Amino acid sequence: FSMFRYSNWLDKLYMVVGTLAAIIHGAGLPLMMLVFGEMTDIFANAGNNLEEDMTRYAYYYSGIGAGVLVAAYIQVSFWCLAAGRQIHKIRKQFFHAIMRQEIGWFDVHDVGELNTRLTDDVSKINEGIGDKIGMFFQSMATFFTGFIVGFTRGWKLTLVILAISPVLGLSAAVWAKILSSFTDKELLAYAKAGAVAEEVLAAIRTVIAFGGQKKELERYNKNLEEAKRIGIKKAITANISIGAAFLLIYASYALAFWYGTTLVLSGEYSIGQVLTVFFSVLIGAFSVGQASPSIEAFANARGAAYEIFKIIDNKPSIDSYSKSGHKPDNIKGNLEFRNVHFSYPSRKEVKILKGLNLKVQSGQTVALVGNSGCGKSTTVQLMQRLYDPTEGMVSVDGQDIRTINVRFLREIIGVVSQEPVLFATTIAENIRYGRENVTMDEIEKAVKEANAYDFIMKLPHKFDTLVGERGAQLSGGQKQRIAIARALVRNPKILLLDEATSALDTESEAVVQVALDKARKGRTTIVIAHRLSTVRNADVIAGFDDGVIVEKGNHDELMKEKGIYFKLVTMQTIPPVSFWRIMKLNLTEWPYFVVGVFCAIINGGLQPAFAIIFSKIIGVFTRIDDPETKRQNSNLFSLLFLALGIISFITFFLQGFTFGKAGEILTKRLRYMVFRSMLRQDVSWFDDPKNTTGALTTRLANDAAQVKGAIGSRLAVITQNIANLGTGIIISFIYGWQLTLLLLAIVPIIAIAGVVEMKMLSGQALKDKKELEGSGKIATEAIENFRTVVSLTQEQKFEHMYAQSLQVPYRNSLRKAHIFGITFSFTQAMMYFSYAGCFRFGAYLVAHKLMSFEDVLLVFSAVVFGAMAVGQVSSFAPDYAKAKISAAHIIMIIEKTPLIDSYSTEGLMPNTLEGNVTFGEVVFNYPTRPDIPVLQGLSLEVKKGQTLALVGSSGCGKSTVVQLLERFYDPLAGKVLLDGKEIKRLNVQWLRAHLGIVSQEPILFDCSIAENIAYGDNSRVVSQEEIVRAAKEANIHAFIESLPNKYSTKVGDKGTQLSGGQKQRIAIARALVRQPHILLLDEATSALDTESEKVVQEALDKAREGRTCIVIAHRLSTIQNADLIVVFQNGRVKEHGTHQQLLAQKGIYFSMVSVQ
C-alpha cells in the first residue's frame, strides 16, 4: 500500500506545491552556509567599501531568509491542509462502509476492536501523512543541496566530510538499537514484578483475609532488585550513547579544523570556504539522520492504512445503500420459509437451522414454539434478512427476499427484539428516528396506542425528554413500550415481537399484549413470548425443533396433539503536587547527585568552551601576523577541541552513571513504598473505580518513569541549560557589549518560537482528540447497536449525523493547520533574519575599530549554537507536566493512610476468644452507593458450640454480612461486639488469622499447591506434614497425591488446570490448615458435583467440632446442617430460630423448603 493518497487529484496539486516549497526551504540552508562563508571570507580579508560589501551580504541573507520563510509557510500549510482533507474523506468513507457492512460480518469482528481501530488509525494516518512527509522532503532537499554546495566548494574538504559522516551515522544507529534493546529487556524484566503486583491486587480480598502482604512484598522486592539493576544499566547506556555521539561530533570538528588549516596554509580554499563546506556537510548529515521519524511514521501509517482500506474496500453481500432489488408498492401478507437451513457464521460447525417448512398468511398472528436455542430468534433474524439460508428458500408475497429491494423491505418491516435498546436521544428523537415522515400525528397515535402518554408526558420535556447515556433514564417497561411505539410508527406491512414483558413483570405484559392485539389485522404479527398465556390466544401457532418444525396448530390443537407445546403447558402448571516533597530521594543520592550536577555543569561549559575554541581557531587565520608557526598554535587550539571531546564523553560516563543509579533507586523506593501503601489500604478504598485493578497496575507501572524523569532529568536539563546560558552570556559580555545586546535580543525570539511550537502541538493534539471523541460518541452509539440500526434501515441518518459531526471540526482542523504552518515558517524566518542582522551589526561595530571580528564571531557562534543545543537538551528530557502530574498522584497515593490500619501495632488481643459474636441494629450499605442501605438493623448472635446459617435474603447482601464480620468495611450504624468485646478495638492481624473465612469462587494464586496451602497463615511455618493432614481432612490428601507432582505441583493462572471443584477443595484445605477457631463458608457449594459437594460439607461439619461455623448455602441440606438458622429480609431478620420452627412458619423459609 505504498501509494496511499487516493482522493482529490485537484487537491493533489496542493501536495505538489507543498513538496516544491519544502524542497526550496530545504535547499535554502546550504545557500545560507555559502553566503555565510562568503561573508566570513570578506570579514577576514577586511582584517587582512567594507560597509558596502557587508550591506550586500546582509541583503542577500535577508532575501534568502524571507524566501525560506515563504517557502516553509506555503509547504507546511499546504501539506497540513491537504492531509487534513484526505483524512476527513477517509474517515467519512470508512464510517459509511462500516455502517454499510454486513451484520453477520460485524458479529464476526469485535465491535470494540473495530471502534478502537477506527478512532486510532484515523489519527495514525493523519500523523503519518500530515507533515512528516513534508519534513522528510525538506530534509532530503537539505541533504542534496548541502552535498552539492560541498562538492562545488572543494574536493578535499568534501571528501573528508563524506568520510566522517558515515562513522557518525553508524554510531547513532548502534546506539539507538542498543537503547531499544535495553528498554525492551527492562520492560520484560519488570513484567515479573508487575504480574506479582497484579495477582496480589486482584486477590486483594483473599490477601487481606490471610494477611499475607509480607510474602508478596518480599517477592516484589526480589523482582525489583533485578528490575532496578536493568533500569540503571539502560539509563547508563543511554547517557553513554549521548556522550559518545557528542564526543564523535567534537572529534570530527577537530579533524576538519586541522585538515582545513593544513589546506589553507598550503594555498587551498580560504577559511570562509572551508568553514562553509564543513558546516554545510555536517548540517546535511544531521538532516539526513533527523529524517528518520518521518519514515517511521510513514511505515506505521502504511500498515494502519492497509488494514483500514482492507476493511473499507470489503464488498458486502448485503448492502444497505444498494437498490438493485425490486420493491412492489402493494405488499400482501405472505411469507414462505421452505427447507431453510441457516448456521451462524460465528459458529459454522453447528447448523442452527437445518431446514424447515413454514408459511405465513396476511395479518396472521403467527406464533413460534420451542425452547432456548430452538431457532426462534435466529429464525426471525433470517426472516428480517439479517442473514441468508445456508440451504433453503425464503420468500415474501411470492417473491424472494433477496430478489426485492432490500431497503424497501427493511423499511416496510418491523422487528422488536427481546432486549430492545433506544439511542441516547430524547424519546421524541428516538421516535422520529423510527419514522421521520410521521408528520407529528403518527407520534401521538403511537403514544396513545402503546399507552405512551402517562410515562412519556411525566418526564421533563414530555415529548423531548432526554434519555441518559444508553437511555439510563427509562425503565424496562417504559423502554419496551417506547420500542413498541417506535415499531408501530413505521406501520410496517408485517411486524415481529419477542419477549413482550420478559423484562421485570407481567404488569406491562397485559397492556403490551392488549396494545399489540389491538392493531394486528392489517399486518402479520410474528408472536414470540416466554409465557404460554399470550401464546394460547395466537390465531396460528407452529412449533420448532432442532432446526425443523414438527408441532403445529392453534393452542387448542396443540394441546390436543399433546406435543412439545403441551409439555411446556404442563411445565407451567486532581490534588496539588509538592515540589519539595519530590526531593524524597535525597536520602539516597544527595551526595551522589553532586557528581551528576558536576557532569551537567561540565557539559554546559563545554558547549561554550567549544564556542571559544572555535573562536580562537577562526582568529588564528584572522590573525594578520599569520606566521608559519601559527599552524602549531592552530594545532594547539585544534588539540584543545579533541581534549574537550574527551571531557564530554567522560562527563556522560558520569551523568548516566549517577542519575541512573539514583533514578532506579528512587523508582525502587517508590515501588517498595507505593505498592506497600496499597497493601496498608482499607478494603473500603479498594471499592472504587479509581482504584481499579488495571488502573492501579498501570499507575504502579507507568509512574516510576514519570517520577524518575521529573526528579532527575528535570534538574539535569535545568542545570545544563542554565550553565550553558550563563557561560555563553558571560563570555559574550566580556568579549564585547553591543554585539552581546544584539544576540540577546535575537536568540530569545527563536527560543520562544520553538517553545510555542511544542505548546501549539500539544494544544492541537488535545483539541483534535476532543473533537474526534465528540464525533466518536455518536459513532460508537451507532456501532454498538448496529443490529438495531440495520433493522431500522436508517443507516443514512447516522451517516448524515457523522458527516455533520466531522464537518463541524473539519474547518477548525484546517484553520489550526494553516496557523501552525504559518508559525513554523515564522520560526525559520526569525532564525535567518537574526543570523543576517547579527553579522550586519557586528560588521558595523568592527568597522568603527571597536570590536575585533574574532570576538564578534565568538559571541555570535556562542549565542546561536548554545541556544540550539540548550533547546535540544530541554527537548531530550521527557515532558515535565505529565511527569509532574504522575508524581503528584503517586505522592498522594503513598501519603494516603487507611481509616483502619491493617498494619497497626496496637490492638486488643486477649488470651483467647469466647467463640461468640453479636450484631444488633446493624446498618451498612456500601461505599460506592450509599443510597441503598443494605442492613436495616438486623439482629444476629453466635455463641460457643453453635453454627450459624443465613437464609431469607439471598441477594440482600448476605455476603456483606460475612465481609463486615471480617472487618472488611465499617458499619453505617448498629452495635457490634466480638464475643462481648470491641471488634474494632481488637487486634489487627489476630482477627484476620483467627477466622477461617472462605469465598464463593476462591481464586488460587498461581503458585505451588503446597505454597497455596501454606498461604493460609504466614508468620508460623507450615510443615509439609501439616499440609498433608489438612488435605486428608478436606478430602485433598487423595486429591493432592493423585495430582501430578503431589503437593509440588503449582496451579496455573487461577488454577486453569483444575476445575472449580478442585479450586474449592484446595481453598477448604487451606482454611483447615489455618486451623481457625471460627470458620465461615459463603455459597462455596453451588452444584460442584452435588455428591462431592455433600461429601465436602459433611467433612466440614466434622471439621466444625470445637468451632463456630457460619454457613451460607442454597442447599436444603445446608439449612438442615446448621445448628442455628437466621433469615434476612428488608435488611432485617424476617425469620430466625430452629429449622423445625422455621419450616412450621409460613415465611420465606417455608416457601424455600417447599419449592426446593
Ligand X SMILES: COc1ccc(CCN(C)CCC[C@](C#N)(c2ccc(OC)c(OC)c2)C(C)C)cc1OC
Task: Tell me which residue of 15, 20, 13 sits closest to 131, measured CA to CA.
Answer: 15
Binding mask 292-331 for ligand ATP (x = CB under 6 A): ----------------------------------------
Check residue 872 for interaction with ligand X (CB under 6 A).
yes
Decide: is 960 part of the binding site for Mg ion (CB under 5 A).
Answer: no
Least distance CB 247 / ligand X (angstroms): 10
Is residue 919 near ligand X by the rule CB under 6 A?
no
Q: Which residues pair with 1127 in a beta bridge?
A: 951
Distance of CA 251 to the CA centre of its chain: 45
Q: Which stretch binds ligand X (CB under 6 A): 282-290, 355-363, 846-854, 1102-1110?
A: 282-290
Least distance from ligand X to the Cβ atom of residue 286, Å:
4
Residue 403 or 872 having the CB closest to ligand X: 872
Rounded Cα gap, residues 547 and 545, in angstroms: 6
The C-alpha cell that represents 541 in the structure block: 401457532
Q: How far is CA 591 from CA 580, 597, 664, 709, in A?
A: 17, 10, 16, 19
User: Which of 40, 502 has the CB closer to ligand ATP?
Assistant: 502
Please identify, using beta-carbon distances, which residue of 291 and 1027 lies nearer to ligand X: 291
Minimum CB distance to ligand ATP smaller for 588 or for 960:
960
Kindly state whether residue 843 participates in binding ligand ATP, applying the rule CB under 6 A: no
Minimum CB separation from ligand ATP for residue 336, in Å? 18
Burial of residue 977, with CB atoms counted within 10 A of its CB: 0-12 exposed, 13-18 middle, 19 or more buried: middle
Q: Does 246 sit near ligand X (CB under 6 A)?
A: yes
CB 74 within 8 A of CB 21: yes
Pick what 290 binds: ligand X, Mg ion, ligand ATP, none; C-beta below 5 to 8 Å, kind-dependent.
Answer: ligand X
Residue 229 to residue 668: CA distance in whole angstroms: 10
Q: Choose the one of Mg ion, ligand X, ligand ATP, none that binds residue 927, judging by a C-beta under 5 to 8 angstroms depending on kind.
A: ligand ATP
The piece of 83-91, 283-291, 464-472, 1148-1156 that touches ligand X (CB under 6 A) is 283-291
Measured from the Cβ of residue 1029, the count of other Cβ atoms closer than 10 Å reads: 16
> Contact 1082/999 with Cβ under 8 angstroms?
yes
Q: Which amino acid, 585?
A: L
Q: The cell 582584517 sits on which residue?
A: 47
Binding of ligand ATP at residue 537 (CB under 6 A)?
A: no
Question: CB 382 → ligand ATP: shortest distance, Å?
Answer: 9
Least CB distance to Mg ion at residue 1083 (A): 5
- To ligand X, the closest distance from the beta carbon of 872 in angstroms equals 5
Q: Which residues contact 701 (CB under 8 A, 6 or more apart)?
A: 190, 194
**Is 499 a residue that touches Mg ion (CB under 5 A)?**
no
- The answer to whether 558 and 566 are in contact (CB under 8 A) is yes
Binding part of the chain for ligand X, among 76-84, 376-384, 851-859, 864-872 by CB under 6 A, reads 864-872
Asked if 832 and 766 touch (Cβ cutoff 8 Å), the reply is no
Binding to ligand ATP in span 889-928, by CB under 6 A? 926-928
User: What is the C-alpha separation between 274 and 253, in angstroms, rounded?
Assistant: 12
199-228 residues near ligand ATP, rule: CB under 6 A: none
For position 959 contacting Mg ion by CB under 5 A, the verdict is yes
- x/- mask, ligand ATP, residues 328-367, rule CB under 6 A, reads ----------------x-xx----x---------------
Round to whole Å and give the CA distance between 301 and 136.
15
Phi, psi of 986, rounded to the nearest 5 degrees: -65, 170
> Residue 956 binds which one of ligand ATP, ligand X, Mg ion, none, with CB within 5 to 8 A depending on kind?
ligand ATP
Task: Supply φ then ψ for residue 109, to 5 degrees.
Answer: -105, 145
Contact letters (x/-) for ligand ATP, 929-948, by CB under 6 A?
x-------------------
183 binds, among Mg ion, ligand ATP, ligand X, none (CB under 5 to 8 A by kind): none
Q: Residue type for 807, please?
A: Q
The listed partner (Mg ion, ligand ATP, ligand X, none) that binds 373, CB under 5 to 8 Å by sort, is ligand ATP
Closer Cβ to ligand ATP, 288 or 1125, answer by number: 1125
Q: Using an 8 Å Cβ cutoff, are 615 and 637 in contact?
A: no
CA–CA distance, 733 with 728 (Å, rounded to integer): 9
Q: What's the one-letter identity of residue 1083?
A: E
Q: Per-residue string for binding with ligand ATP, 1040-1079, x by CB under 6 A?
A: ----------------------------------------
Beta carbons of 537 and 531 less than 8 angstroms apart: no
Known binding residues for ATP are 370-377, 952-959
Residue numbering of the annotated binding site:
370-377, 952-959
- Using CB under 6 A as the criterion, what x/- string covers residues 285-304 for binding ligand X? -xx--x--------------
Compute how many residues bind Mg ion; rule: CB under 5 A: 4
> Per-residue DSSP letters for 6-45?
-S-HHHHHHHHHHHHHHHHHHHHHHHHHHHHHHHHHHHHH
111 binds ligand X (CB under 6 A): no
Nearer to ligand ATP, 376 or 889 (CB): 376
Amino acid at position 1092, single letter: S
Closer residue to ligand ATP, CB minimum distance, 306 or 926: 926
| Residues paired with residue 400 on neighbouring β-strands, in sequence order | 395
Cell 464463593 identifies what position?
A: 1000
Strand partners, 502: none
Rule CB under 6 A: say whether 869 interacts with ligand X.
Answer: yes
DSSP H helices in 915-1023: 958-965, 989-994, 1009-1014
Task: Say if CB 823 and CB 831 are below 8 A apart.
Answer: no
Distance CA 760, CA 147 (A): 33
**CB of 427 vs ligand ATP, minimal distance in Å:** 27
Nearer to Mg ion, 96 or 376 (CB): 376
Nearest distance from residue 32's CB to ligand X, in Å? 8
User: Which residues sit directly before a break in the chain (C to N > 2.5 Å)?
Assistant: 48, 573
Are the C-beta atoms of residues 852 and 846 closer than 8 Å to each other?
Answer: yes
SS3 942: strand
Only segment of 18-26, 245-253, 467-475, 951-959 that touches Mg ion (CB under 5 A): 951-959
Residue among 294 and 813 whose Cβ is closer to ligand X: 294
> How many C-beta atoms surround the C-beta of residue 913 within 10 A?
20
**Member of 261, 720, 953, 1012 binding ligand ATP (CB under 6 A):** 953
308 in Cβ contact with 91 (< 8 Å)? no
* Per-residue DSSP letter, 576: P
Could you tell me if 169 and 289 are in contact, meaning their C-beta atoms sit under 8 angstroms apart? yes
**Shortest distance, CB of residue 344 to ligand ATP, whole angstroms?**
3
Least distance in angstroms from the C-beta of 959 to Mg ion = 4
Q: Is 959 in the site for ligand ATP (CB under 6 A)?
A: yes
- Residue 283 binds ligand X (CB under 6 A): yes
> Applying CB under 6 A, does 687 fall inside the site for ligand ATP?
yes
**By CB under 5 A, is residue 377 in contact with Mg ion?**
yes
> What is the Cα–Cα distance from 757 to 875, expressed in whole angstroms?
12
- Interface region with Mg ion, contact rule CB under 5 A, candidates 478-486, 529-537, 953-961, 1055-1063: 953-961
Applying CB under 5 A, among 1083, 1093, 1119, 1148 the residue interacting with Mg ion is 1083
Alpha carbons 768 and 757: distance in angstroms, whole number: 16
Give the list of residues 6+ apart from residue 216 with CB closer than 8 angstroms, or none.
Answer: 196, 200, 207, 679
501 vs 724, beta carbon nearer Mg ion: 501
Residues at the contact surface with Mg ion, assessed by CB under 5 A: 376-377, 959, 1083
Residues at the contact surface with ligand ATP, assessed by CB under 6 A: 344, 346-347, 352, 370, 372-379, 687, 926-929, 953-960, 1083
Residues at the contact surface with ligand X, assessed by CB under 6 A: 246, 249, 282-283, 286-287, 290, 865, 868-869, 872
